[PDB]
A paper describes a structure:
To obtain structural information, crystals of hPLD3 in the presence of the identified ss T*TCATG oligomer were grown and diffracted to 1.8 Å. The hPLD3 structure co-crystallized with the ssDNA phosphorothioate (*) modified T*TCATG oligomer revealed a partly visible DNA sequence bound within the central active site. The 5′ end of the first thymidine and the phosphorothioate group of the second thymidine were bound in the active site. The phosphorothioate was coordinated by six hydrogen bonds within the HKD/HKE motif involving the active site residues His201, Lys203, Asn218, His416, Lys418, and Asn432. The thymidine was hydrophobically stacked against Tyr411 and was further stabilized by a hydrogen bond with Tyr126 (protomer A) or water-mediated contacts via Asp220 (protomer B) to the thymidine O2. The O5 of the deoxyribose was bound by the Tyr411 together with an alternative conformation of His416 (in protomer B) and water-mediated by Asp220 (protomer A). The remaining nucleotides of the T*TCATG oligo were not visible in the electron density. Crystals for hPLD3 in complex with T*TCATG were grown in a crystallization condition containing sodium iodite. It has recently been reported that iodine preferentially attacks sulfur in phosphorothioate DNA and induces nucleolytic cleavage. Therefore, the bound 3′-phosphorothioate thymidine in the active site is most likely the cleavage product of T*TCATG, which further underlines the 5′-exonuclease function of hPLD3.
Numbering used by the authors:
A (entry chain A): 72 to 96, 99 to 493
B (entry chain B): 72 to 98, 101 to 492
Write the structure that this text describes.
Amino acid sequence: QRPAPCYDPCEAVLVESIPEGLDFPSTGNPSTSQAWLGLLAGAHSSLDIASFYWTLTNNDTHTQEPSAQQGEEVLRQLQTLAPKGVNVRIAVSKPSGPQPQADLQALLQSGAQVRMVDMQKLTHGVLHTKFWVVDQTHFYLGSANMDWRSLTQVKELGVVMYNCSCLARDLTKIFEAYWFLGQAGSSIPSTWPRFYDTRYNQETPMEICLNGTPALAYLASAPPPLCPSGRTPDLKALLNVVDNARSFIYVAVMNYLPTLEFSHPHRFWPAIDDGLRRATYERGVKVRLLISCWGHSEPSMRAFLLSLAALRDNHTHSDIQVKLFVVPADEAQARIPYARVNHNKYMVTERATYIGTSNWSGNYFTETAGTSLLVTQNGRGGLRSQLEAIFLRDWDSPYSHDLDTSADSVGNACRLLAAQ
Amino acid sequence: QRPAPCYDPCEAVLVESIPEGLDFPNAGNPSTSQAWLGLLAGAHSSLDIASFYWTLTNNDTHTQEPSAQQGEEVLRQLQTLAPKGVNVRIAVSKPSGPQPQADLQALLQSGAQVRMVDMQKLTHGVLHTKFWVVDQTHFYLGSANMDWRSLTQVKELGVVMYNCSCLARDLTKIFEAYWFLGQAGSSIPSTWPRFYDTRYNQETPMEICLNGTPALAYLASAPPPLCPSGRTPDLKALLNVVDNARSFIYVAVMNYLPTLEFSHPHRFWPAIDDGLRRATYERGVKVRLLISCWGHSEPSMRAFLLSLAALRDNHTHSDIQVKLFVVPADEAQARIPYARVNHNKYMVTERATYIGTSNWSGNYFTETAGTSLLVTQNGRGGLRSQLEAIFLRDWDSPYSHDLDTSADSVGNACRLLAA
Ligand SMILES: *[C@@H]1O[C@H](CO)[C@@H](O[C@@H]2O[C@H](CO)[C@@H](O[C@H]3O[C@H](CO[C@H]4O[C@H](CO[C@H]5O[C@H](CO)[C@@H](O)[C@H](O)[C@@H]5O)[C@@H](O)[C@H](O)[C@@H]4O)[C@@H](O)[C@H](O[C@H]4O[C@H](CO)[C@@H](O)[C@H](O)[C@@H]4O)[C@@H]3O)[C@H](O)[C@H]2NC(C)=O)[C@H](O)[C@H]1NC(C)=O
Ligand SMILES: *[C@@H]1O[C@H](CO)[C@@H](O[C@@H]2O[C@H](CO)[C@@H](O[C@H]3O[C@H](CO[C@H]4O[C@H](CO[C@H]5O[C@H](CO)[C@@H](O)[C@H](O)[C@@H]5O)[C@@H](O)[C@H](O)[C@@H]4O)[C@@H](O)[C@H](O[C@H]4O[C@H](CO)[C@@H](O)[C@H](O)[C@@H]4O)[C@@H]3O)[C@H](O)[C@H]2NC(C)=O)[C@H](O)[C@H]1NC(C)=O
Ligand SMILES: *[C@@H]1O[C@H](CO)[C@@H](O[C@@H]2O[C@H](CO)[C@@H](O)[C@H](O)[C@H]2NC(C)=O)[C@H](O)[C@H]1NC(C)=O
Ligand SMILES: *[C@@H]1O[C@H](CO)[C@@H](O[C@@H]2O[C@H](CO)[C@@H](O)[C@H](O)[C@H]2NC(C)=O)[C@H](O)[C@H]1NC(C)=O
Ligand SMILES: [Mg+2]
Ligand SMILES: [Mg+2]
Ligand SMILES: [Mn+2]
Ligand SMILES: [Mn+2]
């Protein structure tokens, strides 16, 4: 019945990017930059990267920002891997139109292998997933793109799992589907071959030793056409955490919208929304939704968030709260394209950890590629409590604002607030 | 494979009860009282009544109100039918606990047949339906209970369909299920016998001649265990109207709650709520929900109504609006038990009419008995526009209030306002 357990000494580390000038007067996590540099320096045999886009340099973004140095160093170290014998495979989303690929050209010339995946053709989605698998042993999974802005100008949340080969090998099965689909002539197979299958899923998670105590872990993926036998869909894994919570659900995600954003005519998509309403009304669960806001936020988000916030009622014990996280910007930072936003995508409850790559609207679960890590672990003081502390740090910070906040007071453009 | 059309000269009349003191300047339907007295006077062979409870007299309600006299006259006329040869059959919900039944005892003594239906035992619900079928030819369907207060002290909305035997016989099939289950030793049959089945439903409605022009009509019923082959469930019919609307949905219902109420564990029930959200967001449908409010209103409705009201956004063209209809009550009116509230339960769109007996929460569609009339009819005017005109009269009146209105300022106690 149950699959084999894992004997590897798995260790998980939450890693963040904190934008320049964002201050939290309190503990510290290793930075995305530091963690990535360490992974690269120790890579000896293989590196697989699932990626959305590559802008690791100032030239890529047509900027002259000092704070692009960290991404430029990442690209410099990446270029050293293939010449020293590491097998580098990079899957990247096919861009919407003509676009130079200076980073990937440089990596190809160093000996890395690169394939573009045309998710638009295959599923009408895009390859939005961000992860690394290093020597079939460690992996990074999280919000940070292959982007210098993802290190110093955008807030990111991810995890690095070290020394955990069983789960690294499991994640590689998700990578291999991108790798297969990046080849000329590819199409979605009606049945994925058995070597894509996994035994480790919602019904039977992987038993691992995580920081020296037992834990249950599995990896979910999207979209459904890429799901082989045994692989839990991302949406199912997410809703299972929501449905199982009995005390609180804390969600930090850049975008939340109960719609199929890009499909015509536009379509209502209440899967997650009704899950949250069911949790608070049926089980008294305290729901806190921390949504990001910047100049590029879809303004239709505001009415849907107000609709959830209205479900606060002392007598039913319904208790959903919404705040908007806004990264401030000064004049120089405002000139950097697509920067100064909180990019995290995660959920934590009193009993479970969910760390994802996708924003929370319907296309990310039906058409677009993504991956999430799901962990449960008995006891206190582990990965789950560390992620809860990050959430509460952000939730309580001066960068989080109620929906009635004056837009002219938050330090960056925010479309989801009124002038009132 | 379409079923036979009806050849009867069907004629529909909307009938209301307007509580004493409720004024609408310059807005003219026969009252429930008048319509019921007309049906009783003309009845020559049969009267079937589905009913929730009977309090047609002052003594029933322990009051001394002159406005009870219309209900008392209805009871006096009901007592004349069986002695004159009319077969009277009355189905009534079994009360929660012991209660006197003065009205039904008087009707039994006159020769009427009365059966009490234990819906609590059968389905964990109650027999909430209100309708009359007269001479297998006419019927009343609507919100009014067999209650003197339903004539003069509560606002009611119903319809009388005259001269329409095909549809009246169709409604009797729903009555016959109540009538069977009100017999000692009854149980829900695993399959209902064929004589309960109907051919007229959402997929193939009855073709009738309604006020001289073609129309499509059918009758939906609740709960599912009482549905024989062919009978559309109330919830399916309701959601079909919501899902087919392309311009507006106007709903006037006493209670709206997206829950399976008084269930513990509490159960969320978004069937209708999500249909309205889908309509406004996907199709740009303008939704107006007119919910009643009084001192007995369940206070948890407020958060769910505010949650719908938040979905108004210029650029998505989402446009849901909520108001509360409050019937004023002075200190004398407030001494009357369970009065001074708007009882209507109906929905109208730019293309369809829905008139029901149930409030809009989950138990009414899963466990409790109810019935609704569904009509579509090509053309301007008609029943549909008459019901729309009633809705807008109420919506625009000084008795309808936005959810940010002070609770001091609506003329009666209202639990859904913050003050
Ligand atoms: C499961 O197991 C794993 C593996 O063991 C555990 O992960 C470990 O967690 C440790 C936390 O106890 C963590 O410890 C470090 O965390 C922080 C990261 O330090 C890094 O950055 C520092 C600062 O870098 C800035 O400054 C330098 C110079 O000042 C600049 O060059 C640079 O550009 C930056 O601007 C460096 O100084 C470090 O050398 C390191 O590179 C640090 O904050 C920690 O140090 C201090 O932390 C406390 C409180 O924050 C201070 O009060 C105290 O003085 C410490 O000096 C510390 O170095 C481990 O790094 C991490 N391991 C790995 C491999 O990442 C999981 O926690 C565990 N989970 C459980 C138990 O649930
Ligand atoms: C499909 O066909 C059906 C069948 O014909 C149509 O139904 C008919 O609709 C008619 C509407 O034009 C309607 O006509 C009358 O409607 C009103 C109701 O009249 C009744 O009540 C009056 C009220 O008087 C009482 O008022 C107080 C209230 O506090 C009482 O306490 C007290 O007892 C008073 O007596 C009575 O006076 C009437 O005798 C009657 O019982 C009336 O207001 C209408 O009268 C006005 O209009 C006429 C001419 O239009 C004027 O001459 C008059 O002076 C008034 O201004 C009117 O008589 C029919 O009653 C109704 N038929 C049935 C059987 O119900 C549907 O409308 C049709 N649908 C469509 C879409 O076409
Ligand atoms: C992953 O496993 C390696 C072993 O392969 C760990 O490295 C050892 O760490 C201990 C404690 O710091 C040292 O005593 C050993 O000398 C190290 N050996 C080697 C070969 O490096 C490493 O610390 C583990 N990583 C994490 C994050 O737990
Ligand atoms: C229901 O059917 C009866 C029977 O035809 C209709 O009553 C007739 O109406 C005409 C037209 O006004 C009168 O001239 C006749 O005298 C009536 N006959 C009888 C026996 O009453 C009646 O109008 C129909 N519609 C309604 C709403 O009752
Ligand atoms: Mg999915
Ligand atoms: Mg039903
Ligand atoms: Mn769980
Ligand atoms: Mn319709």
